[PDB]
Design a protein around this ligand. Structure first.
Ligand SMILES: [Sr+2]
Ligand SMILES: [Sr+2]
Ligand SMILES: [Sr+2]
Ligand SMILES: [Sr+2]
Ligand SMILES: [Sr+2]
Ligand SMILES: [Sr+2]
Ligand SMILES: [Sr+2]
Ligand SMILES: [Sr+2]
Ligand SMILES: [Sr+2]
Ligand SMILES: [Sr+2]
Ligand SMILES: [Sr+2]
Ligand SMILES: [Sr+2]
Lengths: 250, 250, 250
């Protein structure tokens, strides 16, 4: 699909690619600092094309082809980005497919738009992101990060291109945490997670499943899966999950 | 009712006329290139005045008293116009009355706002507008329109003041077609159609009725009715339909 | 909580104070010309802090720390202010606590956002405000106010700092009256009212209760309560009402 832009007033314009077709549509919500051109996004687009269903992928504010100053971006702004795509680009019932951060944000979207969002598929769902890990750190480290103004990440995160996080970003993200309360999502949910995920522990998907009020939640745990879940077999699992969900919803 | 304007940010301001009264209110959504001063709109306003119910009529972007450059208007922009009236002017439960294009757009509005829209009445509902006819044309004609950049309409459309349509407008309108999928409208629907309609075939209303998920859909076919459905007897049918629906909803 | 601002496009920015915590959150909607620093608002914030629940208080356009020209403010604009806080600041399920005008506006908010608003608590709910009293006045007085352009209020209103009201404000407020129709609120509602309220008669809360479609409405009438309901015992009643409702909703 070719490049379009959503004009927003007093918020940065968002770049997106849209495929015409049947509803329910699919919206792909990417991972942290990921643009819409990744392996999973493109694979989901090609599957929707073969099924004849509508599809949207897009770039967060500050990322890829979208407008915005990445230095000022926050989880809260990216949450509103998802809502802008859902409200102003998508029409009719939608299945959300969210990777990592995108899985955190798809939950917010389903809470906010319970009529329009008819199912959720998460991949390595990063609910409550790094706020969880920040608050598990010893208090002295928490005060060191605050004084420094940034958290320099453990080396395992460097393998994915993550290195530093501002203190202000962590504190803003606290407003968007969900695991301290029931998650009022009432639609079907499928949560895929690799058990060798070194960024988001697989147990996070079980915590999300437990908090979701919907009784219809499955967690699919892949023994040798890592955080990106983009090997050929992992793409096949994602496509099968989408195909089975569309069938069930029909 | 006297003339008011809805201020929108980075979208053209919309002209509307609003009558105070009881809810459910009625919103009249006009036909293609029709302003809010037509026979049916004024008749519905007078009926709501006699019943004591709230009522809104308005002009699409680019039309009548509204702002906007008509040359840049699209079905997608007019869809958002309807949503702007429903969100920013109307308060409480609404019955939508849509004529021609307005009947296509009322479906979008009910899909998008299922809590607020409590019933639909369509008149010569132009679901999927002229996209249907464009794609039924032979392929060579489709390429001729694309090369020319406009579709010069069959003469029968000239009788209503329709002559030419840009290719770009047709392709944008493809994003808003509904008949390829279930239409997730769950409220009562009444679809009036003249069987001698030379612009939108009466069978279109049966197709819409079949796709609507709501079990409560009636199609009223008037043997000698034409596209505008504005003879005195057709106005009486419309008012009776509104009155009977308000009674049923009470 | 410390002072934040909601940026709105082509509407005045709103000042608010937000407390992080569990959902359901609470939003306090203040009385006419009241800022967010009143006794009840602060008491509800302290209770939410002790319970660990999220909380928002805010200033209407034109009031307190918010932007806006108070001379141009209307009930309709303040209604949209409430919706802006609910949409753009609050996340997840909310209990609305509305005092006086705020109780009128919380009803609008629950009508407009039936998924997000999960309960209502009103204090001296001023449904249909002073429109009711204006239209009970003799016709000659109504024409005198119209010619003068303002209504100089009975002296009993002066005790609360209310003196004059523009005619234009009264007529705009007619658009937001609710008691002429069923009130399509479907959540639990608790309406507190002092029987010695000289500003809003206690019977107004019974009228609201009767019009609300929800079967789950209680009216709590305090024999010696006045309009502000801010004595220590009235604060205790409000906190107990919130605590009992959160328990019931859990
Ligand atoms: Sr812009
Ligand atoms: Sr850039
Ligand atoms: Sr800790
Ligand atoms: Sr299969
Ligand atoms: Sr404007
Ligand atoms: Sr013009
Ligand atoms: Sr064809
Ligand atoms: Sr009758
Ligand atoms: Sr602004
Ligand atoms: Sr000021
Ligand atoms: Sr009277
Ligand atoms: Sr107790």
């Amino acid at each position: 699909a070719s490049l379009s832009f959503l004009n927003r007033s007093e918020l940065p314009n968002l770049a997106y690619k849209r495929l015409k077709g049947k509803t329910p549509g699919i919206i792909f919500i990417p991972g942290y600092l990921s643009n819409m051109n990744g392996i999973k996004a493109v694979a989901v687009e090609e599957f929707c094309k073969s099924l004849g269903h509508a599809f949207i992928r897009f770039d967060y504010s500050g990322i890829g082809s979208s407008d915005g100053n990445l230095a000022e971006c926050t989880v809260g702004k990216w949450r509103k980005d998802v809502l802008s795509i859902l409200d102003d680009v998508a029409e009719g019932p939608q299945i959300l497919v969210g990777s990592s951060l995108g899985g955190w944000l798809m939950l917010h979207a389903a809470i906010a738009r319970p009529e329009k969002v008819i199912a959720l598929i998460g991949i390595a769902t990063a609910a409550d992101g790094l706020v969880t890990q920040y608050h598990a750190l010893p208090v002295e480290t928490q005060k060191e990060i605050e004084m420094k103004g940034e958290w320099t990440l453990p080396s395992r995160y460097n393998k994915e291109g993550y290195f530093r996080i501002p203190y202000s970003f962590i504190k803003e993200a606290e407003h968007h945490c969900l695991l301290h309360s029931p998650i009022p999502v009432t639609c079907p949910v499928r949560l895929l997670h690799g058990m060798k995920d070194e960024i988001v522990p697989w147990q996070r998907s079980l915590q999300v499943a437990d908090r979701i009020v919907s009784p219809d939640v499955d967690v699919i745990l892949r023994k040798q899966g890592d955080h990106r879940m983009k090997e050929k077999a992992d793409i096949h699992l994602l496509i099968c999950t989408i195909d089975d969900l569309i069938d069930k919803l029909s």
